[PDB]
Amino acid sequence: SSEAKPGMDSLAPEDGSHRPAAEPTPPGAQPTAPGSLKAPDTRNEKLNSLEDVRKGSENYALTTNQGVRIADDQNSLRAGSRGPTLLEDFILREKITHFDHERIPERIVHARGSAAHGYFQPYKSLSDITKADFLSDPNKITPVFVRFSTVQGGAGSADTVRDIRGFATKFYTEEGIFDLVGNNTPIFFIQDAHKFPDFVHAVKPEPHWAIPQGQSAHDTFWDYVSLQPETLHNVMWAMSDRGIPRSYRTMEGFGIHTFRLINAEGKATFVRFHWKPLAGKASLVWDEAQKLTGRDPDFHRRELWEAIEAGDFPEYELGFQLIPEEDEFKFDFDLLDPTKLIPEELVPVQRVGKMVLNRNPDNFFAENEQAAFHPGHIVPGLDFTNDPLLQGRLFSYTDTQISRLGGPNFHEIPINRPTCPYHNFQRDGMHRMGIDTNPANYEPNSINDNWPRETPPGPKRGGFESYQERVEGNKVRERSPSFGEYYSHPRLFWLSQTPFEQRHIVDGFSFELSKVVRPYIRERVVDQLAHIDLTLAQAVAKNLGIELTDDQLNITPPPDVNGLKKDPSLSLYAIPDGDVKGRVVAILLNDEVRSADLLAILKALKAKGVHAKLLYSRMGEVTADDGTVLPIAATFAGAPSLTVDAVIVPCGNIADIADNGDANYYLMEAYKHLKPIALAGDARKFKATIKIADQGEEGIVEADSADGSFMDELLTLMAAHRVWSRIPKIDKIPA
Amino acid sequence: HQHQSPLHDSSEAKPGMDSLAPEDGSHRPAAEPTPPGAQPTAPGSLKAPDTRNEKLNSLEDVRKGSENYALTTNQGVRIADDQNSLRAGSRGPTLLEDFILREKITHFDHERIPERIVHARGSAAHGYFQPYKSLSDITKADFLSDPNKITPVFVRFSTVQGGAGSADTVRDIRGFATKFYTEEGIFDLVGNNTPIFFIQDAHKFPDFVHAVKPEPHWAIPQGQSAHDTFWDYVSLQPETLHNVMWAMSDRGIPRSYRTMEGFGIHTFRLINAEGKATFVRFHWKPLAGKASLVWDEAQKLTGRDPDFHRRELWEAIEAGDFPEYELGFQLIPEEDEFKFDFDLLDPTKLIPEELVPVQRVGKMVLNRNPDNFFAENEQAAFHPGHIVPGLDFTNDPLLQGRLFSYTDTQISRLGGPNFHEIPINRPTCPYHNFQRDGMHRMGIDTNPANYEPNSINDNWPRETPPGPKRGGFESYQERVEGNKVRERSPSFGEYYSHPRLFWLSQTPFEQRHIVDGFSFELSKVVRPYIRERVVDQLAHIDLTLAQAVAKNLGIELTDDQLNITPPPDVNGLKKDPSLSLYAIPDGDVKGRVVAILLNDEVRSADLLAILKALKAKGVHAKLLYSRMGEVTADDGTVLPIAATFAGAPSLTVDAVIVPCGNIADIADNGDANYYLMEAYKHLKPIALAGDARKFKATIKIADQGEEGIVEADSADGSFMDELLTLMAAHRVWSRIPKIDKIPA
Numbered sequence A: 001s002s003e004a005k006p007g008m009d010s011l012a013p014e015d016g017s018h019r020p021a022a023e024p025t026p027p028g029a030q031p032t033a034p035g036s037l038k039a040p041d042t043r044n045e046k047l048n049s050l051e052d053v054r055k056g057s058e059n060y061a062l063t064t065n066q067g068v069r070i071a072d073d074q075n076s077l078r079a080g081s082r083g084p085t086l087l088e089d090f091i092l093r094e095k096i097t098h099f100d101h102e103r104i105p106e107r108i109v110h111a112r113g114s115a116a117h118g119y120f121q122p123y124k125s126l127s128d129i130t131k132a133d134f135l136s137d138p139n140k141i142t143p144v145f146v147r148f149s150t151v152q153g154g155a156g157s158a159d160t161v162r163d164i165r166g167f168a169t170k171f172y173t174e175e176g177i178f179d180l181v182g183n184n185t186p187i188f189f190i191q192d193a194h195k196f197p198d199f200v201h202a203v204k205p206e207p208h209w210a211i212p213q214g215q216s217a218h219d220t221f222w223d224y225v226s227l228q229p230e231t232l233h234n235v236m237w238a239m240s241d242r243g244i245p246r247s248y249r250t251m252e253g254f255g256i257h258t259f260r261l262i263n264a265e266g267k268a269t270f271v272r273f274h275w276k277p278l279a280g281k282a283s284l285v286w287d288e289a290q291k292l293t294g295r296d297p298d299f300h301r302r303e304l305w306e307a308i309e310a311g312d313f314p315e316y317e318l319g320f321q322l323i324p325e326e327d328e329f330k331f332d333f334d335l336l337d338p339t340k341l342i343p344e345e346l347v348p349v350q351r352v353g354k355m356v357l358n359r360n361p362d363n364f365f366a367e368n369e370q371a372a373f374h375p376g377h378i379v380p381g382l383d384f385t386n387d388p389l390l391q392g393r394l395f396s397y398t399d400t401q402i403s404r405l406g407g408p409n410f411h412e413i414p415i416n417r418p419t420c421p422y423h424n425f426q427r428d429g430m431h432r433m434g435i436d437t438n439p440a441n442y443e444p445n446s447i448n449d450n451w452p453r454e455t456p457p458g459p460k461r462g463g464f465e466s467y468q469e470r471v472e473g474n475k476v477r478e479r480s481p482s483f484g485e486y487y488s489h490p491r492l493f494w495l496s497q498t499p500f501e502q503r504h505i506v507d508g509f510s511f512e513l514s515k516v517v518r519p520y521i522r523e524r525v526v527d528q529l530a531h532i533d534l535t536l537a538q539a540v541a542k543n544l545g546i547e548l549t550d551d552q553l554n555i556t557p558p559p560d561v562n563g564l565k566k567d568p569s570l571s572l573y574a575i576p577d578g579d580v581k582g583r584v585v586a587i588l589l590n591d592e593v594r595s596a597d598l599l600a601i602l603k604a605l606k607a608k609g610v611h612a613k614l615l616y617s618r619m620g621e622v623t624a625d626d627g628t629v630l631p632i633a634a635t636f637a638g639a640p641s642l643t644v645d646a647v648i649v650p651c652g653n654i655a656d657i658a659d660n661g662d663a664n665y666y667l668m669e670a671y672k673h674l675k676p677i678a679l680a681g682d683a684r685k686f687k688a689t690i691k692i693a694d695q696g697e698e699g700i701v702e703a704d705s706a707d708g709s710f711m712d713e714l715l716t717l718m719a720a721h722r723v724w725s726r727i728p729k730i731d732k733i734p735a
Numbered sequence B: 001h002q003h004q005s006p007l008h009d010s011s012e013a014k015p016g017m018d019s020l021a022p023e024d025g026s027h028r029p030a031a032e033p034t035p036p037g038a039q040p041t042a043p044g045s046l047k048a049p050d051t052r053n054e055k056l057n058s059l060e061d062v063r064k065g066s067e068n069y070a071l072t073t074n075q076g077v078r079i080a081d082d083q084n085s086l087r088a089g090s091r092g093p094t095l096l097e098d099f100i101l102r103e104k105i106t107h108f109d110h111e112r113i114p115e116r117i118v119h120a121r122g123s124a125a126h127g128y129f130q131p132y133k134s135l136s137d138i139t140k141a142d143f144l145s146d147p148n149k150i151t152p153v154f155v156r157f158s159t160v161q162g163g164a165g166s167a168d169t170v171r172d173i174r175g176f177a178t179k180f181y182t183e184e185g186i187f188d189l190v191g192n193n194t195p196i197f198f199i200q201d202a203h204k205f206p207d208f209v210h211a212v213k214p215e216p217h218w219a220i221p222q223g224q225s226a227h228d229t230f231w232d233y234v235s236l237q238p239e240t241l242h243n244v245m246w247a248m249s250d251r252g253i254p255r256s257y258r259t260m261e262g263f264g265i266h267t268f269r270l271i272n273a274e275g276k277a278t279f280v281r282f283h284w285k286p287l288a289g290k291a292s293l294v295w296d297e298a299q300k301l302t303g304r305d306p307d308f309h310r311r312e313l314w315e316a317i318e319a320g321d322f323p324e325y326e327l328g329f330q331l332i333p334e335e336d337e338f339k340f341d342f343d344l345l346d347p348t349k350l351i352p353e354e355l356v357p358v359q360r361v362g363k364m365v366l367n368r369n370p371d372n373f374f375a376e377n378e379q380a381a382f383h384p385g386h387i388v389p390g391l392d393f394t395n396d397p398l399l400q401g402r403l404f405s406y407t408d409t410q411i412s413r414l415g416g417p418n419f420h421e422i423p424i425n426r427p428t429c430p431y432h433n434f435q436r437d438g439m440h441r442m443g444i445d446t447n448p449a450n451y452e453p454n455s456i457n458d459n460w461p462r463e464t465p466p467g468p469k470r471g472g473f474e475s476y477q478e479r480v481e482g483n484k485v486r487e488r489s490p491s492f493g494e495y496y497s498h499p500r501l502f503w504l505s506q507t508p509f510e511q512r513h514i515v516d517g518f519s520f521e522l523s524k525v526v527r528p529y530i531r532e533r534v535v536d537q538l539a540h541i542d543l544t545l546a547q548a549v550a551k552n553l554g555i556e557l558t559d560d561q562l563n564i565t566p567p568p569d570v571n572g573l574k575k576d577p578s579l580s581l582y583a584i585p586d587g588d589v590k591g592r593v594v595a596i597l598l599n600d601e602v603r604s605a606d607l608l609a610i611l612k613a614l615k616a617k618g619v620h621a622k623l624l625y626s627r628m629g630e631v632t633a634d635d636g637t638v639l640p641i642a643a644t645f646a647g648a649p650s651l652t653v654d655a656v657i658v659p660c661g662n663i664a665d666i667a668d669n670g671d672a673n674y675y676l677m678e679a680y681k682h683l684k685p686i687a688l689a690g691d692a693r694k695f696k697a698t699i700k701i702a703d704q705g706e707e708g709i710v711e712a713d714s715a716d717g718s719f720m721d722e723l724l725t726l727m728a729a730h731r732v733w734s735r736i737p738k739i740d741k742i743p744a
């Protein structure tokens, strides 16, 4: 009955094993913790400015929100032991009221997201092309807050779904907040913002039954796509492995729209923003990603948090595609068309700076959930263009943030606050934090000598002025004829893919269309694919039991994009960029592990910054051949192959795990998913479960012992991400 | 056959796209009962327009059509071009004067409302309740007074922990909330799928919820109790152990909302016309029986189909396989309040059916899906404080706090005090009072008076004295004697006897599943001392349970732990078979689904016999192959393919049938072999006809065969009776010792 009474006092273990070490530790070594407790020495101007709202807990009394000390937090106030609860229990009512009101509306789109703190630093001054203060000095450090997201799913949906990913960066500049709100693909599905609710309604769960969550694999999405060919380009990206990234650290970022850079002389240069991952480009395979939404719906959120806790800081290079004003009409596509990409072969990405994400938040709700990004948040030195999708976004973000964040003072929520000064004549509104002392709440005023005052535009610390673009035309609701091309960009993307990426696009479309109940929708989508590429259209049609007509086989292919048939920068894997730091290997233990193998495996993995998870049939410990006590991180079922990048089976008492269904399935799944597998000594007997002949094959590392050559072979395979050459062999594998 | 898109050019970016439906009318689902996957799913009023009740009929004034109507703004202005924003030139800036764009985007920008604090993930349906006989001797509740009185209902089933976008087949408690639209007011029976709750006093609700929910630093994990904070709370609060035992069992992973029980948990009161109070505990007994998934299948199913339960509920209703539940009452006279070892007011305690039987009171049928999920499901507001004359509360300290919570949360979730004016929430009976204003006030009051007592409207609306029928609400005059204290009743201070009773009531396979539930969850707890503290709690329940969990965690029990005296029996009972899902057979095959693995030259005689036998028992089938489209049988019969082997995995079916034909076509297909291996591992019945018996090799079954694997030269009478008998028993429990060697 002591559990139902005040107080329980000290409940922590005497050994202090409840507390995680405040130092970089590998994933699973320590319990995860709020950022300021895990890495207190990791700081920047924004993190430091948040100290005034940080609340501790240690050695403090439990109180009401009014500061009244609570004596009993286990019971309601009642008339007797077994009596009715009394209306006068203000402690119960305050505690329950706050609980009852915890939830706020989720984001209309990108509701599912994971965020981190970091910093940006430019390589050199960009004063020749932009007067933006954050890009003016190589020694200028700009704090950032980045949120990565899916699009369709709710805040409680799964991470490894097939979707476009959001990549939003809040720059806390000395001249205002700049939000770069992008996606992991260089194009969007639609051309004009007016269609945004139509497209979103089509991709989102269907209105009658609210199915499916985090999936475009349903009738309404494909109905919209079939009737709106402008969507075909982004659909091609979503159907590719781009739609299933391995991690937020292994995907690209793009602003999509052409914006303008404005220099001190007033010269405008067209710009498209890019984020290039230091970890390279890497994606999952469909079966692995779908099953991973089951085994770990928080996979990406977890991987992001744990990489930062390990010191494997996600790093991205900021890049600009720069086009002079006089080159506006030099391309086959309209620069203002967000369904069109600018090929890197035509306009190269100029590396401008680097962003490092080095600290997790303290409280997910207060920092991540309440963060408000808006592409309308630009600074002097930047400007918009007439892109009709960007134009509409400018209205949307401010409007949605009012209801989501409960009013017009959302900029006063700590995460959203600028670190630079902010002063104006705006007043009141729900939850007003700032107390204005200004005698005047209007301008022009004489009572406060007209302060705060306007600042003229200038080279630095000047007021914002829009680029004086010449506008000529009649007031029309009309799409520009220049935007009326829908097939060349999807064709360019398709031909830029490797044959194995092309197979994955075919399988992506085939799987999704098989989930469409109305067959005519499938047929209409296949007809659209025939206007892109006949090989793609035939391969999808075959998987759907659809036969193409003679007329469909005679469809003239769309033209090249300014002479380009393909661009290898559009492929995830064509150009190698694979880094092993931060990757994870499963190590399948047995009851009498050969310690020499394990010592060599771990030493080689550590040298490359590759993590390991020791797996067994149960938790606790196992004892090696030399007496070394090995702690078990998880079971074979607990941390499936889906969650790792490679599998290593060291030697020892193999008979212990040879007939274990879970051990054999672990290898079969990793095999099917094209993951590198390494087998030492008697572990080579597992080749039988994966149908591999005695002579072996590429992608299966094997030797008498785990040593120098063995580990170099496995790490080289890990640098290539997956064993693509294994694809013809997986179809026979029951996994 | 060969439908071509009507749009390939710039007409796609212009007004006047006009008729886009296929000429064959294949876009429209049949407005008649159809099996799952046969037709596209549709809003309820379009799928079943002839299915009606008093509540569904009352919603007609707010139903909005679409066919043959002009596209307009919310102000009724006809829109000419819904493809473009207004701009100064075709490549110019968007103009602030585009009121059409701004209205369309504003509405979109404001679509989301806060999800429910708990039970955010849920699926709902319309139906009706009807009592078997008048219960006037025990209650004056109008809805229970006449066997011919039909009460419309709205039911929402849910999980607890996860967000609105979380998965269905998680390990969690399930919510089972029923809104009764009675002639004397709305009565909400807001229950769960277990007879007890985790905690005793409502004051602890935010502590327990915060512990089970995603951890505050990183918001992980979703839809899972398999994390440090949950097990930390459980280890320090033994009152949680009873509901933990239920969550760790297969009760925590139901097969369908149709195959779970429902309970009000709290002891309430029934009040008759003479003023006599009878203590009552509410029960919902599923007509489809009790059935649950196995952990590996449930977890993988959150991946393959996170909408599995929502889908199964909608499709069963569209097929005419209406979810049916018997309302049951455990009745205890006032003088029997202290007759049990446990306190009746203790929500961590169940009333064993062996001590107090469940009396069948009526039946509830769910026969129509909503039209709009947001408007009807998302906006529905259930509250256990919504009682009617003939019902009353008790001093249960968890129920007492719930009375405050629901009204309070509904104000912010539903944007004000007029949430009862939201169509789904409206009573079908009259409602009149002196309450006024508030955000989005729909009702226009004509009463000259907004107060009482008043002479200006001759005191109308007026108070009604309590009585046998159509009387005012009066609380039972319960005697209250005690000092103002924040104190738990000593009678609630017992935490181990109910978890032990539950444990001993389980079959050995159910016990193995409880052990595996605890082992799997605790393996996910990072801090080892938490695992050890939970194992220590299990040792106070049952030593066999604690030892089995400890072994799976590499934990060794101390001599002191092995010497822990077991808790006492519950009023002489060591076990109650009503606590098991499977001890007493109750399995029905209607509404179950079978995967049929096709080949390129299927033996039509086998398929004709399979489908005829399945149809006779109301069992659905899904024809699967390596691709979509069609396959041609041996006699020339064209067979339509419902899904691929990967498209509709074995996780989504109750049994697998492989007919004969060209077996070589699928014999070396990895997906076809894995389908059978997964169904095998998951203890599902498997039937193999003719050359399909060659698949026994992939499931490591000897030539002589085994129980659970139906095999014959052809699919016929005996073959199908054997498979349907296996389906009636739900899973092949005898297969458990063989599954561990299976790589699946």
Ligand code: HEM
Residues within 6 Å of the ligand: A106, A107, A108, A109, A110, A113, A147, A148, A149, A165, A166, A167, A168, A181, A182, A183, A188, A193, A196, A255, A256, A257, A338, A371, A372, A373, A389, A392, A393, A396, A397, A400, A401, A404, B105, B109
């Ligand atoms: C280039 C095309 C687009 C891109 C790259 C894009 C990207 C994003 C991203 C990354 C977020 C989430 C930021 C966060 O982490 O909180 C988001 C939020 C959102 N976007 Fe966009 N978006 C696009 C187009 C649109 C359009 C056309 C509209 C409407 C006219 C729109 C309306 C919204 C809204 C309302 C939100 C939720 C904002 C909030 O609640 O704070 N987006 N978008």
Ligand code: HEM
Residues within 6 Å of the ligand: A096, A100, B115, B116, B117, B118, B119, B122, B156, B157, B158, B174, B175, B176, B177, B190, B191, B192, B196, B197, B202, B205, B264, B265, B266, B347, B380, B381, B382, B398, B401, B402, B405, B406, B409, B410, B413
């Ligand atoms: C016997 C124990 C309990 C049971 C069976 C129970 C059951 C449920 C169910 C089924 C719902 C979802 C109704 C729906 O589908 O909308 C729910 C909602 C909720 N419950 Fe309870 N509950 C219990 C205890 C509590 C306690 C102790 C509190 C707070 C003191 C509480 C607060 C809530 C809240 C705030 C909601 C959301 C209601 C809304 O937003 O409409 N519940 N509960």
